[PDB]
Design a binder for this molecule. Structure first.
Ligand SMILES: Nc1ncnc2c1ncn2[C@@H]1O[C@H](COP(=O)(O)O)[C@@H](O)[C@H]1O
Ligand SMILES: Nc1ncnc2c1ncn2[C@@H]1O[C@H](COP(=O)(O)O)[C@@H](O)[C@H]1O
Ligand SMILES: Nc1ncnc2c1ncn2[C@@H]1O[C@H](COP(=O)(O)O)[C@@H](O)[C@H]1O
Ligand SMILES: Nc1ncnc2c1ncn2[C@@H]1O[C@H](COP(=O)(O)O)[C@@H](O)[C@H]1O
Lengths: 216, 131, 216, 128, 205, 211, 129, 125
């Protein structure tokens, strides 16, 4: 088993550097001759210069059934192809892909490519958290239909001075972890939410509206 | 009347679009840029969506949901592939036809149940006569 | 308040598309004349072609104290500068930056730039999860010193058939949520961790080793 | 019959293989050697590595003894140039060119170069 | 009549500058958007950004039957095409082209495109002249089959009449210390014009 | 002695191909990594990738006193430098350079770099010859102050002896239908391509007489 | 003696490195590419780190921890800035000197307490004469 | 009669100190927006000869080759010295290794790197 990183300029570098440090075997497959030569010199991996979507190049990389192909290209239309090509024609079971358009996340899931959390989504969640810090901002989405949000306890908020047992949260919601001044607090019943504290929440989408209405 | 969705209004693209519209089919022509629609003939009742076929928000805009046929006919194989996969697996279009340039790629389309029109495959027929 | 997206080819597009859809105002500042023209046509934002690190360009973009500057460049040395320039010379309080080298995440935090979760880290966590699915794989890291890991359960695991109350987890660890077959299970005391159930865990680093030793 | 195929690419090598299997003497010219991987196992023909735009390459193909020259690179102008040399410099009777831009087709035939145009081929199928 | 300069970065600029100074009309047709904008600003010509090999672009440039198309591209395969396209489809009689490969000079002549003296040839002639200064080095080749050589010894102290040169050779002009000397009979750096079928003997003598 | 070709994309290739064919030794010094690799594979020369203006690169190429450095760059300001650097710091006596701006030809001569005939000049002479074929068009300029030109007319039916040409002019060679004619006295021109060598201080009168 | 770390062994870079080494200082020269170290002189006892100064793993390799002076002297302002910031805030180097090309950038360095050598600022002096 | 080539950061500073000192200045630059003073300004490429003629270096006491390009500044200087025989020609030279070939043609040089080594000497002590 080797980790086949299929192109992506700089992020492909740091992933390769990471994988190597994790004592894995890495094949970098990149179409940029210039960047290939820079990699070859820096990273201690196998650098195959060429188009990852070409069966021939993939054959040269020797992509095996058990290899993990990671597709990091900025073009989703290419990624999905490079994925299917690796999956159907080479029998690669484990495929990880970057998916640029948040809209395209679905088809990639449907096809059975496993995807890294969408960057632009994370960026949007982070940015919107900064603009509105006192509203339940979504972290990194868990399983399909369960989001992992987070809210900060405002001084003038209703939640302040309330017992976690006494708080009436919906059935499919869990106040997972409280974080008081950079310290994890395990939420027992007799736990009380204080000012300037940060409560992480896991809730199913079909109950998110009510969970926020109650907590905030 | 079929509801045909033609992606890419190019040289080959719009030719499909015109033969379709003149045959009294409801056509939707999607293209990366508007100036491509100049190839759409005078007698053309269909609608045109400007947008990137690799973007999902574009694929939704075409109403492939109500489509009988999706033609993935851009100059990019991977694009055409992506268009087709969305048509087949995301909008469950019964007939999806893709223009595929690289003959080696033809297989992975049909392995996803996407009918393919390949120019190189078409040419080998004609080039056989020249001997 | 506008969202100033300072350059980054494709990811900058989808962010801009996202921001606009969230009814925000967007200023795209990109140095690629070609991509600027593509944006101008597609995205309904203000596209300023030019180097984000140049005070003049930022003046043209009219970056205000309350604006949210998002720096998405592949060069951390540039990002940190574009950040400081925006923060010190323009008084922008809210700065979000991509940080390519996981190593560089720290100095960005130390400087007070808020950062998006590192891509190559996520990718590494996702890839390592696929290679070793039956070992506690880290999700998205919470506050500095508290990681958010997850473990599947093996048919041949000790944790199977044990009460969540009976499980002896360390003080600074929380079994946040169980996910049985794509369904969220709120971990009560009498909850039994069944074989196949995916248990998400929040634990402090100073207790991670023991939490894994016990839960796995 | 002595066929000279220029460009051992996707479409290129397919011509080369159909030719060689048909017991024709083939010469496959290509810009880079890694293209010749696309020629199959049973192939008795010879292969010239070289730039088809350079004259020294065209001489190396022995178009002098050729019955057919196929200009089949991905470049129209290159294919054009190949054909012009075949027709006017080596007086090859049959010269067939792969022409991408359909507007260019005319200037080939106006020099007596038979043309295979993918776009022209496609308009047929897109009619259906 | 306008001079259509079809692409070629820097040399295309200086030719355009030259043509304009010679009170001609210039259409620069270049595929480099960046360089087109630089030209537009500097040169007082018509700059059409686009591929010269595209019929449409040439139509936009309005290449007329009487125009002089100059093709200056580094790709001969392109030049020959851009030439034929301008010649056959637009009816341009006057076409001047750069030809990079000295080997390709012939087909361009055969097609009836008039060509600028090949650079690499001149460069080679100049370089070889510097390496061997005391041997008949060829200048710029005249008509097909007649070369124009020059030489700078037994010939010293001999009358130009007394010198037995072959029939198809002419000692065109002597240059004594940067001064032209008209070679009379009684005349004692000599430029020579000789036909190829007599060059060997002319040099030997 | 080797021929050091210091960069110039395609023309640099064909020169290298030419030099090698003339059994010379060639060092190609080019800054384009991509083109360097193409050369390496095609041409049987020494390809040093790097900036020719950098003393270090030139040291790597081992440019010797006797080597012939050919500078083929599109930038005259660079050429003149690469020249002086090769001439003063490396002691190269023989330097050949392309000079793009016809205006710049002079300073290159003044500095003692020998220059290839200016392309844009030749192009201009060729183009102007095609536009006006029936007027004395200049070929390739000889020594500084002596041009080498070429040209119903009055000259038709006149003896070459009888033609009154100025002192510093020579009717070098007549070319009748692609055949060289050695101009004797009793030679007569007919309605004939006559090549002429004349000094600039006599060009006006030579043309006035020939037409 | 002083433990000087010079980033970028370039035209201006290596000149610092040589004056430092000859003055009996312990030098460490970091550079993106090895061929730059040709510029460092014969008499040079210091160590050389090949690596990208923008990568953190490179900054750790230099031992800025034991440094008295860090010179951020690459041709890139942002790089030199980043180098400096790491020196100042990540390795707490007392003296950090940065080569800054764009004079408008000088301010944001000093606002982070990074002494700056700016060529344009140096030139305005001579161009005054 | 001072001729300053390149009206840039360092460039124009020379031009202003010159003009305010009551000297007749000519500022040559590749692009007009650089000119952002009784002297005259020539827009044009200093590598083109037609530009060098336009500056009237013939009547110049001082030519400053002060563009961001060494080779350009070199070329400017060589024309000043050998084509217009300007007595004083001063060149802005970035690469310190190039300084030599200027002075070997009798072109005075202002090198930032050479200027800096002075100031960087103070910082170590
Ligand atoms: N990513 C894309 N999304 C939508 N349309 C595209 C895309 N890429 C190319 N096209 C269109 O596909 C057509 C294909 O060229 P043609 O050979 O002329 O049919 C062009 O006119 C393009 O505008
Ligand atoms: N100048 C050239 N000389 C020889 N082969 C060429 C030249 N230019 C392009 N080609 C070939 O053209 C082929 C076309 O690729 P394809 O479109 O896949 O058939 C490639 O294999 C190139 O090697
Ligand atoms: N990111 C970097 N890390 C290490 N060295 C660098 C980096 N960027 C530029 N350099 C070096 O900076 C020096 C700049 O050259 P110079 O302008 O002549 O001083 C070169 O030697 C580069 O190798
Ligand atoms: N080749 C050139 N000819 C004339 N001016 C130039 C040339 N190259 C650069 N310049 C100008 O010289 C100045 C050099 O930068 P600086 O003086 O540091 O701002 C800039 O304003 C450039 O526009």
């Amino acid at each position: 088993m080797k980790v086949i990183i299929i192109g992506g300029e700089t992020t492909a570098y740091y992933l390769a550097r990471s994988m190597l440090s994790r004592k894995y075997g890495v094949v970098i497959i990149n179409k940029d001759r210039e960047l290939c030569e820079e990699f070859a010199k820096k990273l201690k991996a196998t650098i195959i210069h060429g188009d990852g979507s070409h069966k021939e190049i993939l054959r040269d990389a020797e992509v095996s059934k058990n290899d993990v192909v990671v597709i990091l290209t900025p073009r989703d239309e290419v990624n999905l192809f490079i994925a299917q090509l690796v999956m159907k024609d080479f029998g690669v079971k484990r495929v990880v892909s970057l998916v640029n358009d948040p809209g395209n996340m679905e088809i990639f899931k449907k096809m059975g490519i496993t995807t890294v959390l969408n960057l632009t989504t994370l960026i949007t969640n982070t940015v919107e958290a900064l603009i509105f810090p006192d509203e339940f901002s979504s972290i990194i989405p868990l399983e399909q239909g369960i989001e992992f949000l987070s809210v900060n306890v405002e001084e003038d908020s209703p939640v302040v001075g309330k017992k976690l047992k006494d708080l009436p949260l919906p059935r499919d919601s869990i106040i997972a972890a409280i974080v008081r001044g950079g310290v994890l607090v395990v939420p027992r019943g007799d736990t009380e939410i204080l000012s300037g504290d940060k409560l992480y929440v896991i809730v199913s989408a079909e109950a998110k509206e009510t969970v926020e209405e109650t907590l905030l | 009347s079929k509801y045909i969705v033609i992606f890419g209004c190019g040289r080959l693209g719009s030719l499909i679009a015109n033969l379709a519209s003149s045959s009294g089919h409801s056509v939707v022509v999607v293209d990366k840029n508007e100036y491509a629609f100049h190839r759409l003939n005078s007698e053309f009742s269909g609608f045109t969506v400007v947008g990137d076929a690799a973007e999902f928000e574009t694929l939704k805009e075409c109403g492939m949901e109500k489509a009988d046929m999706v033609f993935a006919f851009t100059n990019d194989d991977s694009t055409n592939f992506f268009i087709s996969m969305n048509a087949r697996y995301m909008f469950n279009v019964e007939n999806v036809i893709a223009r595929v340039y690289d003959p080696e790629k033809i297989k992975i389309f049909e392995e996803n149940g996407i009918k393919t029109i390949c120019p190189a495959v078409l040419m080998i027929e004609k080039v056989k006569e020249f001997i």
